[PDB]
């Protein structure tokens with residue numbers, strides 16, 4: 001049963017991400033500045049679903065890591081790299097939507113394909129500098145008896161960090177983008193209300209749930225998927241024995257599930273539906 | 282009143298012409314198409330050696 | 336005034352007496368052409384806005400296109416290389432032409448004037464050579480009779496023959512009621528036909544300057560007109576989703592090309608080198624290939640994401656070029 | 669052999685200039701000026717300045733490009749497909765010509781024809797109801813009455829939301845709002861939410877007619893983006 005569920009999750013993630021990527025690549029009407037960020041987000045989710053999930057599933061089911069310590073370190077590094085680079089792209093998408101509405105006249109000059117490429121490489125470099133660099137140089141390892149013993153054991157693959165890294169990585173990956181997204185979407189909601197109020201005043205007699213039904217979905221899925229884990233990450237390092245090891249993995253997998261929802265949230269436009277009808281059937 | 286006269290004069294110059302039967306005209310068109318069907322790259326595909334766009 | 340009704344009755348009676356058979360009744364045993372499948376070979380990019388006009392060269396290698404952004408680019412089909420790019424004084428451009436000798440290019444639009452550009456002469460950068468004025472309405476089409484004379488049609492319900500050296504209307508043609516939308520020249524350049532917005536097509540004489548015949552079979556404005564390679568027939572297409580073939584000698588319609596699953600307009604028509612295939616562009620984002628002698632569809636051209644507004648076939652009949660509002664050109668084979 | 673390399677040199681130079689022109693093309697807004705006739709288009713053009721005719725004016729470092737087609741005069745408009753991708757259409761109508769020969773009904777018919785076109789299905793209209801003082805004069809004077817030419821005016825009453833300017837007579841504002849609602853009804857009936865209408869009361873002495881267009885275009889672009897992102 002557990003294997004069936006995990007295989008279904010892997011298949012769903014891979015299918016959705018591959019479909020979105022090939023739909024963007026095949027056609028020319030879907031190649032705009034906005035779709036580049038969506039392409040980058042779809043890449044990380046595919047790499048996440050293709051690499052991280054199968055090996056974590058095998059480690060959970062077998063209850064024993066059957067590879068060397070090098071592979072465990074590499075797997076942890078790519079896990080952090082994929083998680084970091086996926087959240088930070090949603091912030092970029094939100095900022096682009098913010099600039100498209102509040103300043104409509106200067107939006108064309110503000111963002112260009114070259115600027116989009118520069119931003120994407122900057123995001124990926126920042127994501128890579130916080131995952132491979134501190135892990136491969138062994139700057140994140142803990143210094144207690146269980147951590148040392150399990151590092152020594154060749155069959156371990158477990159997570160043990162000190163306070164500084166567990167705080168810094170969590171802050172960079174989650175907490176900085178959250179404030180930006182909140183501010184952006186609040187301002188967008190205010191602009192929508194202003195326009196709706198103008199329309200009603202001008203021509204109301206002849207004739208805000210629409211904005212809520214979208215913004216609430218967008219923010220709620222992300223928050224409910226990634227908040228509990230990034231709270232318990234700080235909690236279990238702040239004080240010991242409060243958080244069991246079996247809840248850390250559960251919350252982490254709940255966060256992993258979010259990779260399979262992004263294509264539904266961000267690719268529901270009529271153009272994407274038409275493109276999907278062509279490639280499929 | 283001149284416009285009516287101009288139209289009437291024009292109608293008289295397009296009714297006094299020598300017309301042929303539709304059968305002969307259709308036969309002529311069919312014969313031309315059949316004769317020149319050999320030299321039609323779109324109708325009969327040309328080999329890739331002679332194709333300049335491939 | 337009532338004499339016109341009697342005169343028109345005599346014309347209909349004679350035209351009814353001539354028709355003793357149907358084009359379909361004699362081209363009934365002809366084997367069909369089958370199915371024709373064409374694939375895109377080239378795609379030309381560089382226009383910032385939608386495209387209205389396009390014209391091939393007599394060398395079957397170079398072509399010109401016009402766009403609403405205010406430019407006029409000359410392409411190289413074989414290598415996909417831009418050769419020239421002429422900025423236009425007025426952005427709104429509706430037509431373009433390419434000279435038979437390859438030394439000039441015409442232009443025109445909503446400014447009511449026609450401009451002639453000099454390409455292969457002593458011009459490192461292309462510069463305006465002449466400007467022809469005198470129309471009181473927007474231009475619709477223009478074709479080069481020679482290196483010194485040109486014929487144009489406008490929304491003034493009139494067509495004119497110009498002299499580039501002096502810049503005056505040598506001959507003017509009158510008789511249409513609505514705007515003239517297209518024209519085409521005969522291979523010998525002695526007669527030409529035009530299609531207007533009053534659902535009527537007329538046959539003109541270049542030297543004499545007087546109309547000869549009138550054909551009326553459409554229910555709406557005629558948008559495109561093409562001329563049979565033989566020189567004794569022509570085909571038109573209107574925005575009621577019908578193409579019709581007329582015969583000059585018989586002075587009547589021969590066959591109509593329509594289907595019940597299409598209801599959009601028609602923007603362009605063109606024949607093939609032999610004349611067996613009729614290619615027509617529609618508002619349904621695509622193009623259709625017809626059988627001239629049987630009125631049966633033989634294929635379909637798809638790949639454009641907006642209206643198809645231009646269509647042309649090379650002089651050697653080797654390739655087909657289509658322009659669209661998606662600011663792209665495609666070559667089919 | 670060297671011929672192929674020679675052509676690519678000219679291709680690179682041409683493609684460099686096309687990049688500069690794309691920046692200008694996407695940073696400018698095109699407006700179409702349309703009027704019924706004897707409405708006051710020339711005066712409206714004159715105040716913003718301070719075949720075909722084009723004017724340039726820039727407000728708040730934004731470039732606008734206005735077109736006035738006057739060479740083509742006909743009752744049928746087949747050139748109107750050329751303006752599929754304009755930002756807005758400016759419609760000018762003389763509000764005081766409700767009795768002279770009816771010109772107001774002809775303007776309403778023209779507006780209805782423009783609104784329901786198959787190609788202008790995503791273009792908003794900025795409406796300028798011109799000649800306000802003549803209307804006020806001939807309404808205050810009892811020489812003529814509106815209900816003689818528009819029977820529906822008898823049963824019409826001013827709405828509670830109306831805010832007349834100080835010192836204005838109730839009859840004048842009733843007439844103004846009736847004429848405005850005559851256009852607003854046509855605008856609202858067939859609209860699907862993809863394009864609206866922005867009506868304004870203008871005059872010869874007005875000087876703020878260049879800010880109204882700026883504000884309306886900003887609203888148009890903002891609403892288009894909001895609708896695109898499924899927020900409106």
Ligand SMILES: Nc1nc2c(ncn2[C@@H]2O[C@H](COP(=O)(O)OP(=O)(O)OP(=O)(O)O)[C@@H](O)[C@H]2O)c(=O)[nH]1
Nearest residue numbers: 703704705706707708709710711798799800871872
């Ligand atoms: N009192 C008054 N008169 C105006 C106003 N606008 C225009 N007029 C007058 O109306 C006359 C005709 O208006 P024009 O400014 O010529 O506009 P137009 O060229 O007639 O407009 P079209 O006929 O549509 O081209 C002019 O002589 C103006 O003086 C206005 O706001 N108030």
Ligand SMILES: CN[C@@H]1CCc2c(ccc(O)c2O)[C@H]1O
Nearest residue numbers: 079080083084159169170173252
């Ligand atoms: C073992 N799983 C890791 C553990 C810690 C961690 C993750 C993701 C992003 C971060 O910034 C982290 O610090 C998780 O994917």
